[PDB]
């Protein structure tokens, strides 16, 4: 899960890393009052949404009057911010971070992820701050410096110094940089992060390092042992259906298309989406039923997939699982009636009672085709949305 | 076959829990030589007609098992796996889903240093049709045969199992490397085993978005795999930077798309198939 | 450095491990007041000295009246406690630990050291608590259970459970034991301990684990990063000369003998002691001059070695070092006069100006023999104390 | 000779500090191929006529040095050593005294896994008389020769150097394994190197109280060392449970006394000498 910039900065502060003085504000009044608490302006005001590119979308402004802070807060609170990193629906702005302006001398990049190829937490730094790290990696790889945290020793100061020197830092900036590396590495390990990105890590004109932005991603598989992070989850930043799906043991990711997919298995879910795409269809979503395809779960699955108005048909692809094919068929039937599924449903069943489950579907009289295998299933759902 | 065979003696950690029980029952019915289980606190009892031990070392001393399958909730896996490595278990199959990446980061380093093989986590398991079944896969779709299967996905594996059984090729061994970002074993590890296994005449490699194990496997196959390989990568239509079910099914930093993996495999001379329904057809072609 | 039992128990408490309710008392009044703060007696009163075997020496009593607590405190405060683990001079009792009585059902042993053979922190547990762990290891090794902390993973719960089950613990005692293992392992690593010993780790009649005693040893090389431990040092528990020597960069350990030894080098110091012993002498001390054999340091060295009345001669054995032999000779001469060294001194010098330094000694007229090599040096100091 | 020779290129970490400077000057005068040094913050300067680098990797890339000697205060050693291992240095000689045991516990595991050899810490160093000197020993007492010396003590080593030089045997290489409880290399490691070194005809093994490296070396020598070995153990008169200078010179749990070590070495057929003054005589006997 992602954290807001302000939450990332609170965490940094907690680890003694530096960030501008700032206040997360939920009302324009709090935002304007932040000004004098911060001090002399100008002040940076920032919409807090998980997505990046807020600057390009107008969600980050440097203003110089309480009146402007308030106007910006009034403009954004409760509104959705669309950036190149959110879908066209953007993300709700429920907090405006108001922080002190920072005198920027230079912008650096410092970040860390779990590198799967080397199977290590890898920190990377670059003098190319303020730019998407991907762009810099593509074009000036030689400008990206990396160190892998050694699982046996924990992060070491020489690694922080290595990056610091490769960035051409010198004097106290080397120690400051090393300290930031050590703290961020420590946060990464202790809070089970999957991602840290300080872009930009700024060298201020006064000669100090400061985290001007912060993007933190937590490993969701570790939240059971990260109670603090657990509470920081902001569900408003995600499609609410994902959380609904999850509390029902379904993994749902909405897509652009119109052919809903309900499959047991992440791999099969993606494969099913791909095969639907291959046969001319446009998958509307990924939905891995994971959990036992019970009547209740399948019903929820439909409710969730169907909450998307664009869905014109639903392809159910179930291979195996803990529920016999005929029970799944009964459940699909119950879901269809009970949810008032008014779209055509194509079903591909494999396992015990595949053909009997198929019969039950065929005999229900509901608009549900039992397909004969994958390809057929794909072709049929594709055909089922023809004209819709 | 690789990894397991009719002689593999297996203990189950988390033996008395729901999944451990249910799937050990399945392994037992399949004829897998389950010889015991481990559930701290229930040592000395018997379950599914087998001895339950408090620790893996007790289990190993008592049964001589070289393989352990794990059905322990994610919070305790690192502990379970490290225990098994410490008890001398040489093959660990970790079914468990949800293990923190950082835990696996450390476990992987341990496994490699101790020379212990782990399949998983978040895997349906391993099955050598007709000889040994460890995991949650349905055993009545398999057919003792010649195709080795490695996959980051359980369900896609099943599709490929269905196809290789329907075409009569059958399977030598099916290995789910699991859907996590840092598995205990990767494609390259399993590929090398299939290349060296006389019973395996062809390999089906099934991958998906995220990471670069497939791309690396591609380079490996080109230079070290002589047997024909049929590849399938799921997630061509997956958005970037979004987890698609599996913790490992996420395209980070725009890298690791399905297309890049197909491309990489094509360039290494692997027979790829755009539709998961055509794996059997592609094998017929190369066999 | 060693910690007092009460300090060990405070640390355990800090790590959520359990110890009897107790108060460290510096006056009989504090000791008696501890009684009602603890509750209903009887109460265990314990002299706090670093050495073990306090029980056998009368330093641990279970009393049942405030009057007895006070009498025991009055009896021991400011007095020295001699145990089989201290020299005949004992250790000063400046604190009496007054704690709640514990209903003992069973005594176990749990301890940890850095095992040099396996190069791991090794925890060991035994059902044989209340007995010197060495005795149990000698006679019933099969009753000592061990686990090595893996540097890569940190202590793991299965290791705590392994020991717990080998101790035949069951039910909640297994979890309690595992928790104690995890906490003590964590303390070991975080505080840079060299040693932990809970003897006895008690299973109370109420069915709980409790640390009835605690012996903690800190790695002195790590005190620079253990500020809390640093402050807990109780110098009264050691021969004050060791600390004096150390602040002068000398390593001094008093022995029984009468031939003082001043050598540069730990190995040479021990070898010199051994060669003096081999040639019929009895070394009075170990003193590794380490630091530059300057006049000041050598002078201190003599003051320290000579503060022991039993010393009848001093053998100085200097091989190498950062100071030329002739300067060392001048310093030995200055020390001898200035310290008023009134005992014979035998000197063995090797290095630059060995023979000239020897000449300077011979020409000083002070009672200092320059020896010709090691064996000779030994024989001569031995002979020098003949009759004294 | 072992470990180092006239071709060994060495960098010094802590190069610009007092001891690093002073002893690099000595190494330089001896003809040791010091090619550079590392002091974070002083990269790009020159010291003792050699380049100073900010990091060991810079030093290694610039000079090709395979060995590093460390004169870095104890609090920063773990960091220094791990840096050197990371920079590809294959031989680390750590002079530093006072390194926390727990730091060395971890460093040792690292060294062994990375295949990096470390001599030390708390060691006078290593010297192959006539070819290479790394450390703080006085080089004018040595004589290129045939006796290999391994010791947990610098001063005792010198005594043995004096004797083997006086008897004309000379030294192949003198290795101080250092006085810490967990050294980077132990007797067995160095012994094997001497056994395999043609230039070494006899070995002087000098130990002291504490631990069991000597006892283990004894068993090793009996079965794998054919060259004559003369042993000397200091601390026969040391009290138990008291540090005698060296952090490793302490008898813990009544184990590791000098007598036990002499006994163990005697039983393995090693020529031991009760007086440190008789090492030269004992070598004459076995040569
Ligand atoms: C591991 C998983 C299957 C466990 O689920 P589960 O069986 O319902 O969990 P339960 O609590 O019933 O059983 C777990 C058992 O492990 C035991 N356990 C806990 N820690 C243990 C340890 N260190 N060693 C051994 N057993 C341990 C518990 O005691 C419990 O047994 P008990 O009920 O006898 O006390 C589940 O968390 C999971 O990961 N499911 C997804 C599996 C999956 O889909 N994989 C990918 C397929 S492609
Ligand atoms: C290591 C030891 C020699 C250092 O002492 P020292 O030279 O007086 O210490 P100094 O502070 O003068 O020099 C240390 C240098 O290391 C540098 N340093 C610190 N961390 C460093 C690192 N990670 N990498 C490289 N250099 C580092 C410092 O910058 C300092 O140099 P500078 O003065 O140019 O800034 C000393 O602490 C020690 O262990 N002495 C005992 C040696 C011994 O007796 N061994 C056993 C003999 S048998």
PDB file of N, CA and C in Angstrom, chain C residues 22-70:
ATOM      1  N   UNK C  22      11.402  -6.432  42.891  1.00  0.00           N
ATOM      2  CA  UNK C  22      12.509  -6.159  43.776  1.00  0.00           C
ATOM      3  C   UNK C  22      13.054  -4.754  43.696  1.00  0.00           C
ATOM      4  N   UNK C  23      13.835  -4.407  44.717  1.00  0.00           N
ATOM      5  CA  UNK C  23      14.413  -3.104  44.849  1.00  0.00           C
ATOM      6  C   UNK C  23      15.865  -3.247  45.213  1.00  0.00           C
ATOM      7  N   UNK C  24      16.703  -2.469  44.535  1.00  0.00           N
ATOM      8  CA  UNK C  24      18.141  -2.440  44.810  1.00  0.00           C
ATOM      9  C   UNK C  24      18.228  -1.372  45.894  1.00  0.00           C
ATOM     10  N   UNK C  25      18.852  -1.710  47.019  1.00  0.00           N
ATOM     11  CA  UNK C  25      18.913  -0.828  48.153  1.00  0.00           C
ATOM     12  C   UNK C  25      20.314  -0.512  48.599  1.00  0.00           C
ATOM     13  N   UNK C  26      20.602   0.766  48.844  1.00  0.00           N
ATOM     14  CA  UNK C  26      21.935   1.175  49.259  1.00  0.00           C
ATOM     15  C   UNK C  26      22.033   1.423  50.763  1.00  0.00           C
ATOM     16  N   UNK C  27      20.898   1.365  51.468  1.00  0.00           N
ATOM     17  CA  UNK C  27      20.895   1.554  52.923  1.00  0.00           C
ATOM     18  C   UNK C  27      19.924   0.579  53.512  1.00  0.00           C
ATOM     19  N   UNK C  28      20.138   0.224  54.775  1.00  0.00           N
ATOM     20  CA  UNK C  28      19.250  -0.710  55.435  1.00  0.00           C
ATOM     21  C   UNK C  28      17.835  -0.157  55.431  1.00  0.00           C
ATOM     22  N   UNK C  29      17.692   1.166  55.565  1.00  0.00           N
ATOM     23  CA  UNK C  29      16.373   1.772  55.584  1.00  0.00           C
ATOM     24  C   UNK C  29      15.651   1.527  54.261  1.00  0.00           C
ATOM     25  N   UNK C  30      16.376   1.663  53.157  1.00  0.00           N
ATOM     26  CA  UNK C  30      15.777   1.393  51.833  1.00  0.00           C
ATOM     27  C   UNK C  30      15.410  -0.084  51.732  1.00  0.00           C
ATOM     28  N   UNK C  31      16.270  -0.924  52.283  1.00  0.00           N
ATOM     29  CA  UNK C  31      16.033  -2.345  52.258  1.00  0.00           C
ATOM     30  C   UNK C  31      14.794  -2.684  53.064  1.00  0.00           C
ATOM     31  N   UNK C  32      14.636  -2.075  54.225  1.00  0.00           N
ATOM     32  CA  UNK C  32      13.464  -2.445  55.027  1.00  0.00           C
ATOM     33  C   UNK C  32      12.203  -1.875  54.389  1.00  0.00           C
ATOM     34  N   UNK C  33      12.321  -0.714  53.779  1.00  0.00           N
ATOM     35  CA  UNK C  33      11.149  -0.115  53.180  1.00  0.00           C
ATOM     36  C   UNK C  33      10.718  -0.875  51.972  1.00  0.00           C
ATOM     37  N   UNK C  34      11.654  -1.605  51.362  1.00  0.00           N
ATOM     38  CA  UNK C  34      11.326  -2.452  50.207  1.00  0.00           C
ATOM     39  C   UNK C  34      10.303  -3.536  50.561  1.00  0.00           C
ATOM     40  N   UNK C  35      10.298  -3.980  51.817  1.00  0.00           N
ATOM     41  CA  UNK C  35       9.427  -5.047  52.209  1.00  0.00           C
ATOM     42  C   UNK C  35       7.986  -4.766  51.922  1.00  0.00           C
ATOM     43  N   UNK C  36       7.448  -3.690  52.480  1.00  0.00           N
ATOM     44  CA  UNK C  36       6.037  -3.425  52.214  1.00  0.00           C
ATOM     45  C   UNK C  36       5.808  -2.997  50.772  1.00  0.00           C
ATOM     46  N   UNK C  37       6.822  -2.409  50.122  1.00  0.00           N
ATOM     47  CA  UNK C  37       6.625  -2.086  48.707  1.00  0.00           C
ATOM     48  C   UNK C  37       6.511  -3.425  47.955  1.00  0.00           C
ATOM     49  N   UNK C  38       7.228  -4.444  48.390  1.00  0.00           N
ATOM     50  CA  UNK C  38       7.117  -5.701  47.688  1.00  0.00           C
ATOM     51  C   UNK C  38       5.788  -6.392  48.050  1.00  0.00           C
ATOM     52  N   UNK C  39       5.454  -6.368  49.335  1.00  0.00           N
ATOM     53  CA  UNK C  39       4.230  -6.987  49.753  1.00  0.00           C
ATOM     54  C   UNK C  39       4.495  -7.935  50.886  1.00  0.00           C
ATOM     55  N   UNK C  40       3.655  -8.957  50.954  1.00  0.00           N
ATOM     56  CA  UNK C  40       3.773  -9.936  52.010  1.00  0.00           C
ATOM     57  C   UNK C  40       5.088 -10.687  51.813  1.00  0.00           C
ATOM     58  N   UNK C  41       5.804 -10.921  52.898  1.00  0.00           N
ATOM     59  CA  UNK C  41       7.037 -11.661  52.783  1.00  0.00           C
ATOM     60  C   UNK C  41       6.680 -13.126  52.554  1.00  0.00           C
ATOM     61  N   UNK C  42       7.639 -14.049  52.706  1.00  0.00           N
ATOM     62  CA  UNK C  42       9.001 -13.678  53.090  1.00  0.00           C
ATOM     63  C   UNK C  42       9.649 -12.937  51.928  1.00  0.00           C
ATOM     64  N   UNK C  43      10.831 -12.388  52.160  1.00  0.00           N
ATOM     65  CA  UNK C  43      11.520 -11.656  51.127  1.00  0.00           C
ATOM     66  C   UNK C  43      12.913 -12.209  50.928  1.00  0.00           C
ATOM     67  N   UNK C  44      13.374 -12.214  49.691  1.00  0.00           N
ATOM     68  CA  UNK C  44      14.728 -12.655  49.409  1.00  0.00           C
ATOM     69  C   UNK C  44      15.606 -11.413  49.461  1.00  0.00           C
ATOM     70  N   UNK C  45      16.700 -11.484  50.221  1.00  0.00           N
ATOM     71  CA  UNK C  45      17.628 -10.376  50.275  1.00  0.00           C
ATOM     72  C   UNK C  45      18.950 -10.914  49.705  1.00  0.00           C
ATOM     73  N   UNK C  46      19.554 -10.152  48.789  1.00  0.00           N
ATOM     74  CA  UNK C  46      20.776 -10.564  48.147  1.00  0.00           C
ATOM     75  C   UNK C  46      21.825  -9.480  48.005  1.00  0.00           C
ATOM     76  N   UNK C  47      23.031  -9.799  48.467  1.00  0.00           N
ATOM     77  CA  UNK C  47      24.143  -8.917  48.327  1.00  0.00           C
ATOM     78  C   UNK C  47      24.331  -8.824  46.839  1.00  0.00           C
ATOM     79  N   UNK C  48      24.606  -7.643  46.346  1.00  0.00           N
ATOM     80  CA  UNK C  48      24.859  -7.506  44.935  1.00  0.00           C
ATOM     81  C   UNK C  48      26.372  -7.382  44.706  1.00  0.00           C
ATOM     82  N   UNK C  49      26.998  -8.436  44.198  1.00  0.00           N
ATOM     83  CA  UNK C  49      28.408  -8.375  43.832  1.00  0.00           C
ATOM     84  C   UNK C  49      28.470  -9.085  42.523  1.00  0.00           C
ATOM     85  N   UNK C  50      29.475  -8.776  41.721  1.00  0.00           N
ATOM     86  CA  UNK C  50      29.546  -9.399  40.424  1.00  0.00           C
ATOM     87  C   UNK C  50      29.754 -10.907  40.483  1.00  0.00           C
ATOM     88  N   UNK C  51      30.546 -11.353  41.427  1.00  0.00           N
ATOM     89  CA  UNK C  51      30.797 -12.777  41.546  1.00  0.00           C
ATOM     90  C   UNK C  51      29.586 -13.632  41.884  1.00  0.00           C
ATOM     91  N   UNK C  52      29.659 -14.898  41.479  1.00  0.00           N
ATOM     92  CA  UNK C  52      28.591 -15.833  41.795  1.00  0.00           C
ATOM     93  C   UNK C  52      28.931 -16.563  43.101  1.00  0.00           C
ATOM     94  N   UNK C  53      28.099 -17.536  43.474  1.00  0.00           N
ATOM     95  CA  UNK C  53      28.323 -18.292  44.691  1.00  0.00           C
ATOM     96  C   UNK C  53      27.985 -17.485  45.922  1.00  0.00           C
ATOM     97  N   UNK C  54      27.161 -16.439  45.746  1.00  0.00           N
ATOM     98  CA  UNK C  54      26.807 -15.566  46.886  1.00  0.00           C
ATOM     99  C   UNK C  54      25.966 -16.351  47.895  1.00  0.00           C
ATOM    100  N   UNK C  55      25.183 -17.281  47.375  1.00  0.00           N
ATOM    101  CA  UNK C  55      24.345 -18.079  48.238  1.00  0.00           C
ATOM    102  C   UNK C  55      25.204 -18.862  49.187  1.00  0.00           C
ATOM    103  N   UNK C  56      26.165 -19.585  48.635  1.00  0.00           N
ATOM    104  CA  UNK C  56      27.033 -20.386  49.468  1.00  0.00           C
ATOM    105  C   UNK C  56      27.781 -19.555  50.488  1.00  0.00           C
ATOM    106  N   UNK C  57      28.004 -18.278  50.204  1.00  0.00           N
ATOM    107  CA  UNK C  57      28.755 -17.422  51.112  1.00  0.00           C
ATOM    108  C   UNK C  57      27.880 -16.666  52.110  1.00  0.00           C
ATOM    109  N   UNK C  58      26.582 -16.943  52.101  1.00  0.00           N
ATOM    110  CA  UNK C  58      25.685 -16.278  53.035  1.00  0.00           C
ATOM    111  C   UNK C  58      25.093 -14.978  52.512  1.00  0.00           C
ATOM    112  N   UNK C  59      25.385 -14.621  51.264  1.00  0.00           N
ATOM    113  CA  UNK C  59      24.886 -13.383  50.698  1.00  0.00           C
ATOM    114  C   UNK C  59      23.485 -13.412  50.116  1.00  0.00           C
ATOM    115  N   UNK C  60      22.753 -14.492  50.330  1.00  0.00           N
ATOM    116  CA  UNK C  60      21.393 -14.597  49.820  1.00  0.00           C
ATOM    117  C   UNK C  60      20.651 -15.298  50.942  1.00  0.00           C
ATOM    118  N   UNK C  61      19.607 -14.658  51.434  1.00  0.00           N
ATOM    119  CA  UNK C  61      18.828 -15.204  52.513  1.00  0.00           C
ATOM    120  C   UNK C  61      17.375 -14.925  52.232  1.00  0.00           C
ATOM    121  N   UNK C  62      16.524 -15.813  52.724  1.00  0.00           N
ATOM    122  CA  UNK C  62      15.097 -15.575  52.597  1.00  0.00           C
ATOM    123  C   UNK C  62      14.659 -15.232  54.001  1.00  0.00           C
ATOM    124  N   UNK C  63      14.217 -14.009  54.218  1.00  0.00           N
ATOM    125  CA  UNK C  63      13.824 -13.621  55.557  1.00  0.00           C
ATOM    126  C   UNK C  63      12.335 -13.324  55.605  1.00  0.00           C
ATOM    127  N   UNK C  64      11.772 -13.240  56.807  1.00  0.00           N
ATOM    128  CA  UNK C  64      10.359 -12.970  56.894  1.00  0.00           C
ATOM    129  C   UNK C  64       9.991 -11.805  57.776  1.00  0.00           C
ATOM    130  N   UNK C  65      10.920 -10.901  58.055  1.00  0.00           N
ATOM    131  CA  UNK C  65      10.564  -9.740  58.858  1.00  0.00           C
ATOM    132  C   UNK C  65      11.389  -8.545  58.430  1.00  0.00           C
ATOM    133  N   UNK C  66      10.762  -7.383  58.464  1.00  0.00           N
ATOM    134  CA  UNK C  66      11.446  -6.152  58.115  1.00  0.00           C
ATOM    135  C   UNK C  66      12.725  -6.038  58.940  1.00  0.00           C
ATOM    136  N   UNK C  67      12.619  -6.453  60.190  1.00  0.00           N
ATOM    137  CA  UNK C  67      13.729  -6.416  61.110  1.00  0.00           C
ATOM    138  C   UNK C  67      14.891  -7.252  60.558  1.00  0.00           C
ATOM    139  N   UNK C  68      14.602  -8.410  59.985  1.00  0.00           N
ATOM    140  CA  UNK C  68      15.657  -9.247  59.433  1.00  0.00           C
ATOM    141  C   UNK C  68      16.244  -8.673  58.137  1.00  0.00           C
ATOM    142  N   UNK C  69      15.385  -8.035  57.348  1.00  0.00           N
ATOM    143  CA  UNK C  69      15.858  -7.434  56.111  1.00  0.00           C
ATOM    144  C   UNK C  69      16.901  -6.401  56.549  1.00  0.00           C
ATOM    145  N   UNK C  70      16.497  -5.529  57.469  1.00  0.00           N
ATOM    146  CA  UNK C  70      17.390  -4.500  57.970  1.00  0.00           C
ATOM    147  C   UNK C  70      18.664  -5.088  58.579  1.00  0.00           C
TER     148      UNK C  70
END
